[PDB]
Amino acid sequence: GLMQFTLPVRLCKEIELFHFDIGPFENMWPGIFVYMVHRSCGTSCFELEKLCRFIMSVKKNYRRVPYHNWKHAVTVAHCMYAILQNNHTLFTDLERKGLLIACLCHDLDHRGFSNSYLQKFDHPLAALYSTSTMEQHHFSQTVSILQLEGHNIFSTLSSSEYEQVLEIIRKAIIATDLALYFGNRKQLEEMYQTGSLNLNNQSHRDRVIGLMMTACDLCSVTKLWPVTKLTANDIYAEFWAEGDEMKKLGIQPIPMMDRDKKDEVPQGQLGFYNAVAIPCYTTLTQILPPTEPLLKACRDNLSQWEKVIRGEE
Ligand SMILES: Clc1ccc(Oc2cnns2)c2ccccc12
Ligand SMILES: [Mg+2]
Numbered sequence: 021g022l023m024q025f026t027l028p029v030r031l032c033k034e035i036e037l038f039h040f041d042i043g044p045f046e047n048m049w050p051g052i053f054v055y056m057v058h059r060s061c062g063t064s065c066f067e068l069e070k071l072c073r074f075i076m077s078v079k080k081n082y083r084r085v086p087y088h089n090w091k092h093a094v095t096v097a098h099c100m101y102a103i104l105q106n107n108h109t110l111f112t113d114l115e116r117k118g119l120l121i122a123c124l125c126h127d128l129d130h131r132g133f134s135n136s137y138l139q140k141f142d143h144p145l146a147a148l149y150s151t152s153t154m155e156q157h158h159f160s161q162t163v164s165i166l167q168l169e170g171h172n173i174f175s176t177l178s179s180s181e182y183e184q185v186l187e188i189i190r191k192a193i194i195a196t197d198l199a200l201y202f203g204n205r206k207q208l209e210e211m212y213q214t215g216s217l218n219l220n221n222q223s224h225r226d227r228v229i230g231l232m233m234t235a236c237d238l239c240s241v242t243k244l245w246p247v248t249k250l251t252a253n254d255i256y257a258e259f260w261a262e263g264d265e266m267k268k269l270g271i272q273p274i275p276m277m278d279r280d281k282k283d284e285v286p287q288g289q290l291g292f293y294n295a296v297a298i299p300c301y302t303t304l305t306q307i308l309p310p311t312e313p314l315l316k317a318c319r320d321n322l323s324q325w326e327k328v329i330r331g332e333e
């Protein structure tokens with residue numbers, strides 16, 4: 021309980037910034053995650069023996085895929101840490117505990133394919149879960165790991181606190197289904213602009229946590245350009261494999277996923293920034309002003325994509 025985690029000076033400082041990259045050293049990621057829980061939640065939230073055993077089982081159940089991997093898990097958890105630390109007083113003890121774990125768990129056992137490819141392939145998980153297929157599986161895998169012996173990091177909570185924190189985690193993980201984001205953001209837009217947004221309304225908190233999750237999940241677009249550009253290779257590597265697998269089912273994939281249409285990428289990024297990323301962080305900055313740096317970074321990268329098209333890089 022007196023055993024703090026410390027980072028090197030550069031990481032100690034950089035980690036507090038939204039645009040922080042967790043680095044190429046896999047063996048430091050678990051200490052980074054624990055450092056973030058201890059500062060975000062307190063050194064008292066989790067039994068360190070249990071948290072460390074949870075972290076390593078969660079790492080184990082991420083696959084070696086180009087993008088939806090252990091590094092993504094921690095990257096997304098760091099973005100939530102930054103949001104939580106810049107909005108200290110707006111979130112309950114349970115929400116701080118639950119959301120960092122939700123982020124670490126949000127993509128558990130991802131295979132590299134969209135809900136859409138699971139449905140066209142007729143994957144057993146598409147029969148077990150008709151909507152938000154991969155996201156119901158991710159939450160399902162989270163509960164499994166929490167239920168391993170020595171892995172219940174919530175064991176010191178009351179029965180009711182426990183049901184609250186698994187409910188926070190379930191909503192949070194489901195909300196990373198980008199299909200649900202559009203509607204969630206429009207409702208939040210309307211509530212903020214007709215002034216009816218109320219953070220004491222549980223149904224309204226749910227929506228705001230949902231948007232935070234979408235924000236953390238898309239935070240690749242909020243890094244400094246060299247990080248954003250290199251992550252896009254990993255993102256597109258998964259997309260083109262899925263495209264290849266669509267072709268194998270005798271279905272032309274959308275151009276985004278067709279590796280014969282690499283030319284179309286920069287325009288596809290534009291569409292994504294304009295349709296998804298900028299709207300996401302605009303609405304998030306309105307509800308949570310201290311998250312503006314995410315919007316500013318996302319804007320800078322939209323501009324960097326415009327320069328790619330114009331042949332200036
Ligand atoms: Cl740059 C970026 C980040 C996240 C995205 O959403 C995803 C959904 N599933 N895997 S990645 C993007 C989708 C298209 C183009 C760019 C994207
Ligand atoms: Mg996901």
Ligand SMILES: [Zn+2]
Nearest residue numbers: 092126127237
């Ligand atoms: Zn994700």
